[PDB]
Design an enzyme around this catalytic site. Structure first.
Site, PDB file in Angstrom:
ATOM      1  N   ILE A 123       0.859  -1.163   0.000  1.00 35.41           N
ATOM      2  CA  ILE A 123       0.000   0.000   0.000  1.00 35.41           C
ATOM      3  C   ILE A 123       0.891   1.205   0.000  1.00 35.41           C
ATOM      4  O   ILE A 123       1.789   1.339   0.860  1.00 35.41           O
ATOM      5  CB  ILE A 123      -0.899  -0.072   1.234  1.00 35.41           C
ATOM      6  CG1 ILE A 123      -1.923  -1.158   0.974  1.00 35.41           C
ATOM      7  CG2 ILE A 123      -1.533   1.274   1.577  1.00 35.41           C
ATOM      8  CD1 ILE A 123      -2.729  -1.530   2.179  1.00 35.41           C
ATOM      9  N   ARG A 157      -2.484 -12.321  -0.279  1.00 41.97           N
ATOM     10  CA  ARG A 157      -1.275 -13.187  -0.363  1.00 41.97           C
ATOM     11  C   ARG A 157      -1.442 -14.590   0.117  1.00 41.97           C
ATOM     12  O   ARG A 157      -0.758 -15.532  -0.413  1.00 41.97           O
ATOM     13  CB  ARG A 157      -0.140 -12.568   0.449  1.00 41.97           C
ATOM     14  CG  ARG A 157       0.377 -11.278  -0.170  1.00 41.97           C
ATOM     15  CD  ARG A 157       1.388 -10.597   0.733  1.00 41.97           C
ATOM     16  NE  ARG A 157       1.911  -9.374   0.160  1.00 41.97           N
ATOM     17  CZ  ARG A 157       2.154  -8.281   0.873  1.00 41.97           C
ATOM     18  NH1 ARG A 157       1.902  -8.297   2.155  1.00 41.97           N
ATOM     19  NH2 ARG A 157       2.631  -7.179   0.317  1.00 41.97           N
ATOM     20  N   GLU A 170      -2.485  -8.731   2.874  1.00 38.30           N
ATOM     21  CA  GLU A 170      -2.038 -10.012   3.454  1.00 38.30           C
ATOM     22  C   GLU A 170      -3.031 -11.199   3.140  1.00 38.30           C
ATOM     23  O   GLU A 170      -2.583 -12.369   2.909  1.00 38.30           O
ATOM     24  CB  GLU A 170      -1.684  -9.957   4.934  1.00 38.30           C
ATOM     25  CG  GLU A 170      -0.667  -8.884   5.317  1.00 38.30           C
ATOM     26  CD  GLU A 170       0.778  -9.203   4.932  1.00 38.30           C
ATOM     27  OE1 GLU A 170       1.012 -10.131   4.126  1.00 38.30           O
ATOM     28  OE2 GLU A 170       1.691  -8.508   5.481  1.00 38.30           O
TER      29      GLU A 170
END
Ligand SMILES: *[C@@H]1O[C@H](CO)[C@@H](O)[C@H](O)[C@H]1NC(C)=O
Ligand SMILES: O=C1O[C@H]([C@@H](O)CO)C(O)=C1O
Length: 246
Positions: free
Chosen positions: A71, A163, A160
């Site tokens: 970000i 991911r 996250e």
């Protein structure tokens, strides 16, 4: 762009958003069937815009670097906010250019700096979809201490989760009740770069890691990851950071 609406959100719709976020990121190859993020992207195309709406329907737009899912900053109404780091400075040349002003947050985006600013490690900060509602609400009006915490929540619930399917699932379990992240979550977050590198190096080593990666599993136990047959690789990780960027 991708979008997510907290109003009416449920695990299914969050899971859908996360899938869309992953699918917004470009790749030309897969490595053990996991999309390999590009080494580099030229100019404006480097940044994905993620529109997030809180329960009341106010919105921020978050800029994400498609090569690393970092970000860079976000737009709240007519004010842009970027981390205090070279990459986000660059991003600011390309995104949210018609904001009336640009604020540089008084910290970089790395976890350790955010934690210091927030005044607590992210082990102690509850996450979940209600925490994400709170985070968006915080970011709507500038407060740097509060924003550090909101940013920790924002990072973990969006990037996250994109991911790691396990983190996506953690957030799904926290759809209507925030809870601090499990050690396993922290461990994956901390290991994404290392995992990404070993998975790429395994290709040329018959799926075997040059250096094993130590994690915490769902049960709270330490596990050592040695090769691409591990569930971490076959089921959990969803995006690989290019070794060019490690
Ligand atoms: C690879 O990983 C699996 C799953 O952890 C493990 O049981 C096995 O011993 C490992 N194989 C090799 C060749 O290292
Ligand atoms: O190295 C890091 O990259 C991200 C950050 O860029 C924000 O997305 C993060 O949280 C780290 O510790």
């Amino acid at each position: 762009d991708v979008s997510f609406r907290l109003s009416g959100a449920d695990p299914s719709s969050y899971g859908m958003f996360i899938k869309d976020l992953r699918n917004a990121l470009p790749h030309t190859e897969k490595v053990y069937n996991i999309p390999l993020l590009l080494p580099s992207v030229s100019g404006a195309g480097r940044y994905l815009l993620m529109h997030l709406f809180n329960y009341d329907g106010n919105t921020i737009t978050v800029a994400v670097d498609v090569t690393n899912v970092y970000i860079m900053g976000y737009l709240a109404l007519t004010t842009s906010y970027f981390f205090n780091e070279p990459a986000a400075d660059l991003a600011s040349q390309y995104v949210f250019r018609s904001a009336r002003r640009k604020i540089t947050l008084p910290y970089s985006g790395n976890y350790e700096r955010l934690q210091i600013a927030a005044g607590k490690p992210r082990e102690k900060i509850p996450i979940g979809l209600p925490a994400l509602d709170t985070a968006i609400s915080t970011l709507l009006h500038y407060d740097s201490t509060a924003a550090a915490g909101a940013l920790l929540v924002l990072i973990q619930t969006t990037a996250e989760a994109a991911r790691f399917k396990y983190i996506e699932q953690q957030i799904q379990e926290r759809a209507y009740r925030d809870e601090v992240p499990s050690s396993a979550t922290i461990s994956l977050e901390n290991s994404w770069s290392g995992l990404s590198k070993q998975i790429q190096l395994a290709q040329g080593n018959n799926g075997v890691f040059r250096t094993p990666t130590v994690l915490v599993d769902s049960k709270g136990n330490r596990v050592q990851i040695t090769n691409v047959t591990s569930n971490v690789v076959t089921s959990n990780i969803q995006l690989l950071l290019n070794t060019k960027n490690i």
